[model samples]
Target: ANLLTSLVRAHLDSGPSTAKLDYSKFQELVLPHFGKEDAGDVQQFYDLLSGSLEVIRKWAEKIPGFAELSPADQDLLLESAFLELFILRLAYRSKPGEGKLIFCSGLVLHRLQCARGFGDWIDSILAFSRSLHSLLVDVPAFACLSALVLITDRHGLQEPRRVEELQNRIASCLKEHVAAVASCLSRLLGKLPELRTLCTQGLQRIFYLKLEDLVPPPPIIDKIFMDTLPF
Candidate 1:
């Protein structure tokens, strides 16, 4: 028990042990939470980490008994918690659902980091993170809105290399996660007068249709940079 505890604690405490839990001490402390019976289905815990949702739930049924630990500890072993990260890592290649899960994982990381202090790269990471997190949490349909806007707007105006970089970034991030960002993304593309006119024309075709059919405008579209106007 002490060996396993140290192993887990060492991994989680790679940086500073903000929670101040050491290895041997931490494991011994957690072992009792398992209680006297061994629950009769001990292998179910391993099954949860197997990345199968059906098998995971089977293990999760016995999990509530371990709630005596701190919230962090409890979460560390929760089937859902393991599933979240597992899906993110395992599904990154073939499964969009897994990618969506990773995006959500990034949000949890962002919120946790925010509780500490804001970091420099966090803006891009958060923007990247939120764009994905939004798919998983906020607006599942419109999560690609920001990245599309950033790419389209920054493409021609920025250095050519930088433009391609941003475009590739968005493309890479959106890969397999969404079918067509063209609708929500059209708003960013609309910043160009020609694109804006085209959007208006498209809207006119389905004027009576639901708002969902038309490309929605961005929240801050009204706040244009007048300073860019030629004096």
Candidate 2:
């Protein structure tokens, strides 16, 4: 646990800060390429998010107990948790005051610019991003939170009990770490249900995008989207 906490904090603290771009540059370089039906723009967004999910997957593998899961269970867990982890990583790196969401590749897009193809949920995502920034969650705490996010009980796990046990351990560690800031701990825990809500909402947003059929999703992302179907 100590090793995981320390390593996660190091990575989180050293992660890139959000890049800034002026309104004109955003309009000229970004806006012209995206709209209700922009294939290039959709592919760009897909690549950004898929890259974020890969980072989270690697991080989860390093966490104790995560690697112990069966390969099939590991895949299922990553598949199910991808959106939540992506949003968590996004919120961590976002500069809400600057109105920018920075991707792993360091591409900065205006929150409003995202609405063109990310679906109407862009406003909601911005609001959530702002709230994340406002909370000012530090790296160690966020590491604990993210650890919990990956370890949570999800459907179709072969060893749900083992997953729950790991989650409980992480929860205890989080409680201990945040003992000095009771209110902060409360706020962090409060975000759980909100994240679950966002998870479903994110899936809905993707479903809406598919219905529009402006651009085809890449094979990997298409598979992910398909897995979440029957909504």
Candidate 3:
């Protein structure tokens, strides 16, 4: 049912309305920058990322049945899924052929614009965007994907069963045989592990930045990176 859509759209909020082009205004908006090798894209990239994390933190509180989990579990889930949801929402907002990236606040920038901050990861996102956009996964499906990313069970959860029930409620919206959805769901699952790879690359980037000590990353980002580490 679209009920899932209503809840997700409420918290997942919004992304990129690219009708008017204002580079100056959008500069104050957001994009990524892991290309320290590309130089300078890294600083602003983290700012935009940390900004979006605040929005995500607010959204995490609103998910239906989210509060039932202990507060500790809530933070764990949000921290664990932070980058995955970032990439997922980014992919959903982009236009594959256009080379444009739209941030959460509707800021639009070209792929070349994000290249330095994103490095080769920009290509990774673009490929995912192309696959997702062509399938035309609608708002309802998109919203479900966003929630499922956050609510799924993780090792540190204090109440995995509670999160699991919440996970199933969100996951239920995705079960269907309609051609677009059937294809979309399979492709979507197919991308998630790929998404895991993207998340690892992100951790790698953050680790590199930490080593350089050029800028202190936001505490939340630092905290997220620590939790995400495999060791």
| Candidate models: Cα lDDT each | 0.29, 0.70, 0.71
TM-score of each: 0.21, 0.84, 0.84
Off by over 4 Å in 2: 1-35, 180-183
lDDT of 1 by residue, 48-108 (tens): 2232433333333332222333443333233213323233222221122212212211211
Ordered from best to worst lDDT, the candidate numbers read: 3, 2, 1
Return the lDDT, model 2, position 120.
60
Residues 92-179 of candidate 3: C-alpha lDDT, one tens digit per residue: 8766786777777666777766766656777888887887777787776677777877878778667787777766766666765233
**Tens-digit lDDT string for candidate 2 (1-231):** 574465475445434544432233253234354325466556666766666765776677777767788998888778777888788777777677767776644566776667555666556667777787788777777777887887776667789998888887777777876774466778878887888888788888677667766666668778877875655
- Give stretches of model 1 more than 4 Å off: 1-141, 153-158, 179-195, 198-225
Query: lDDT (0-100) at residue 144 of candidate 1?
Result: 32
Residue 56 lDDT (model 1): 30
The best candidate by TM-score is 3
How many backbone clashes does every candidate have? Answer: 0, 0, 2
For all predictions, the C-alpha RMSD in Å is: 23.1, 3.5, 4.0
lDDT value for model 3 = 0.71
Q: What is the lDDT of residue 67 in candidate 1?
A: 33
Ordered from best to worst TM-score, the candidate numbers read 3, 2, 1
Task: Say which prediction, candidate 1 or candidate 2, comes out ahead on TM-score.
Answer: 2
